[PDB]
């Protein structure tokens, strides 16, 4: 069944999910590239915890104690808390789930506190999973409350209506044309090995990752610079922001190619105007980044055209356009 996503800060992936046998609501970021889901505790003692939605283990009687300490030292900054078990509810779905009771975060500001998001809902894989636990999604076919282990993320192509995340079947009302599966090259994240072109620049068999947590398309650095050098573009000086005309011709289509079907992004799709309505000026959603080897990343703007679906049961990924 469906869940409603709203826009946060040009990352339209927040949704509601519930903990425990009463209504414990948390604004969730449904991450595709993170494994374990985590929540701000009532006993969270950190500065920003002030205004965010709290988990009270005690008022929900399903609390299966684990109470073992977890050290989630992420890429930005650090989240640490204590494992807890309880019912986790999306819509009609609720189940026995081992998650993180968070007491303390540090380096995730300035972005966390400003946003409405409360919690990170990991939708990833077991290897990424510390605690070596199967993911929510997998522990539902395991413990029958739905049939097949699959999720789909729908972001509307005019960035105005409601977005959805489904779990159950491919909901056909979403996509357009055939839907395309692709073959994962890791059991780590939802990544796949693709050829990807912009200018004359091309990086054959480069590993790519779908990421709903990230609000820009990412490209290795030297990929970037090679067209971009002459691709007259500008900056907020030594601070990662990049800019050109909204009326720009020179600009290539993000070509993301595979032995089945190519996924293209048009200039009109990875640019956002700045002077609000009737603006001359646009910011690419492309930031140069070497995460790793030949690693590109596809975040919101991508999902904002291509409807994506994610299949544990097939180690496959959904790709089609949107309604």
């Amino acid at each position: 069944d469906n869940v409603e996503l709203k826009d946060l800060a040009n990352v339209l992936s927040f949704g509601e999910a519930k903990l425990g046998d009463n209504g414990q609501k948390f604004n969730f970021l449904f991450h595709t590239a993170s494994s374990n889901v985590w929540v701000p505790s009532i006993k969270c003692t950190s500065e920003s915890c002030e205004s965010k939605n709290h988990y009270d283990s005690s008022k929900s009687k399903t609390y299966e104690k684990d109470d073992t300490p977890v050290k989630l030292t992420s890429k930005a900054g650090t989240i640490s808390g204590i494992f807890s078990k309880d019912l986790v509810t999306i819509g009609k779905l609720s189940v026995p789930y081992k998650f993180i009771e968070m007491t303390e975060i540090v380096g995730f500001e300035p972005f966390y506190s400003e946003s409405d998001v409360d919690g990170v809902f990991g939708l990833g894989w077991k290897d990424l999973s510390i605690g070596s636990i199967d993911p929510y999604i997998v522990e539902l076919k395991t413990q029958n409350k739905i049939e097949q282990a699959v999720y789909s993320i729908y972001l509307p192509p005019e960035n105005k209506n409601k977005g959805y995340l489904t779990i159950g079947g491919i909901e056909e009302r979403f996509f357009d044309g055939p839907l395309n599966y692709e073959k994962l090259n890791h059991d780590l994240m939802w990544q796949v090995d693709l050829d990807v072109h912009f200018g004359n620049v091309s990086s054959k068999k480069a590993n790519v990752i779908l990421d709903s947590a990230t609000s820009v398309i990412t490209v290795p650095t030297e990929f970037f610079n090679q067209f971009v050098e002459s691709a007259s573009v500008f900056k907020v000086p030594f601070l990662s922001l990049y800019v050109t005309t909204c009326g720009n011709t020179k600009l290539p289509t993000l070509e993301y190619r595979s032995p089945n079907k190519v996924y293209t992004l048009e200039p009109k799709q990875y640019l956002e105007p700045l002077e609000n309505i009737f603006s001359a000026l646009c910011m690419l959603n492309i930031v140069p980044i070497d995460l790793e080897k030949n690693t590109f990343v596809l975040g919101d703007p991508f999902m904002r055209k291509y409807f994506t679906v994610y299949d544990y049961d097939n180690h496959t990924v959904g790709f089609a356009l949107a309604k």
């Binding site: 970021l29 947590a213 990230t214 609000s215 820009v216 930031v287």
Partner: peptide
């Protein structure tokens, strides 16, 4: 941006 893999 908000970049969240290393």
């Amino acid at each position: 941006x908000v970049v969240x893999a290393x």
